[PDB]
């Protein structure tokens, strides 16, 4: 009964939320002289991160240090992810600053934690550091950093990233390019966001959604609508968020006849019982005066 067969069990128990049974297994293989390893600690820590089991995380961390695993990339990446998802980003950073080896996954993990906490400056400074040290950003880096530049109004950095993304061969990458549309839009440059959109060879829902949001926040309500029907003509199916954006676009205009066709579309796509479309419909109808309708929408 190997380390590998004990780890396969713990992992399954860990992915099913069963931390009590996972730990009993841990302590049993320890008792039988079978040493835990990378997978064991990283398996347990990943569950701690999902469930917010901070305290067990902190005890494992203790156990990790006492058994000579300081600096191990797999374990310490999981330490970063665990402290991060338990809200403790100073601790996540300490784990980071202590790692002698860092890969793109190390940086990506701490960048993603910082962006979710609104600590956007530290994420951009960390991205700069990653470039300075010669680690190549990937799709997830460029995407998360551009989204941070967008929320921050950091136009000049975004434009440098745009250059870097172009040179590293990421022109065809829809995730990164959805991020560029967001960055230009939120930085006040709908013309440049339009240019990005019209250059992309592939477009999914999120690229239509991202550009609609930018037009609507800019008050370019008619442009938002022309684009929405463009989306429908190309066969890209709207989602929860598309409907909410164009209905509010309609609920910010005398666009009732279009809000009604969208209501029909929304009913036929399976979205009438969807909470934000709910409220976007109730909203759209109310701003259009017909208040029975809104009641009709609500009274479901």
């Amino acid at each position: 009964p190997t380390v590998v067969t004990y780890n396969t069990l713990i992992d399954g128990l860990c992915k099913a939320g069963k931390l009590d049974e996972a730990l009993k297994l841990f302590e049993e293989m320890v008792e039988k002289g079978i040493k835990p390893d990378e997978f064991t600690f990283s398996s347990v820590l990943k569950a701690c991160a999902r469930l917010g089991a901070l305290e067990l995380g902190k005890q494992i961390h203790g156990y990790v240090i006492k058994s000579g695993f300081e600096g191990n990339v797999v374990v310490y990446n999981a330490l970063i992810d665990m402290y991060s998802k338990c809200g403790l980003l100073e601790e996540a950073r300490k784990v980071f600053d202590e790692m002698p080896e860092k890969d793109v996954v190390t940086y990506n993990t701490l960048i993603d934690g910082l962006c979710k906490a609104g600590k956007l400056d530290e994420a951009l400074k960390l991205f700069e550091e990653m470039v300075e040290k010669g680690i190549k950003p990937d799709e997830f880096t460029f995407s998360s950093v551009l989204k941070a530049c967008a929320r921050l109004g950091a136009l000049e950095l975004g434009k440098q990233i745009h250059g870097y993304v172009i040179k590293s061969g990421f022109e065809s990458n829809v995730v990164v390019y959805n991020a560029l549309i967001d960055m230009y839009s939120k930085c006040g440059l709908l013309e440049e966001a339009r240019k990005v959109f019209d250059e992309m060879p592939e477009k999914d829902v999120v690229t239509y959604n991202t550009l609609i949001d930018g037009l609507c926040k800019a008050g370019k309500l008619d442009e938002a609508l022309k684009l929405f029907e463009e989306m429908v003509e190309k066969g890209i199916k709207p989602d929860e968020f598309t409907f909410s954006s164009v209905l509010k676009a309609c609920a910010r205009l005398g666009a009732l006849e279009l809000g009604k066709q969208i209501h029909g579309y929304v009913i036929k796509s399976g979205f009438e019982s969807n909470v934000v479309v709910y409220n976007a419909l109730i909203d759209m109808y109310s701003k259009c005066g017909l208040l029975e309708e809104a009641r009709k929408v609500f009274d479901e």
Partner: protein
């Protein structure tokens, strides 16, 4: 102004509301759609002819080829919730969606 593909105001989605507990069967809903259409159009032959689609699952309503003036006559009729202009679901195929009703034959969807 801006119009959804297929929204020519000669195609109408008429959404209805039935008791949830217990729901009438699939065939009773279908029956109700044709009866309600025939009450506005004056006969059952005009109802079967002009009902091109319906659903009893993702929604409970029917789709018919009528003009706007006629679609107004459905409002406030028993069980009539929504009177909305229809639109394509698949723009490429000019398909309005739902289970299809072609002169009494039903071709379900996907």
């Amino acid at each position: 102004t801006i119009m959804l593909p297929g929204s020519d105001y000669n195609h109408w989605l008429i959404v209805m509301e039935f008791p949830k507990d217990p729901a009438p069967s699939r065939d009773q809903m279908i029956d109700t759609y044709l009866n309600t259409l025939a009450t506005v159009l004056g006969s059952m032959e005009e109802a079967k002819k002009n009902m091109y689609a319906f659903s009893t699952t993702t929604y409970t309503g029917f789709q018919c080829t009528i003009d706007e003036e006629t679609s107004e006559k459905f409002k406030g009729l028993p069980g009539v919730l929504w009177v909305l202009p229809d639109s394509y679901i698949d723009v490429k195929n000019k398909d309005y969606g739902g289970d299809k009703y072609i002169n009494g034959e039903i071709i379900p969807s996907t």
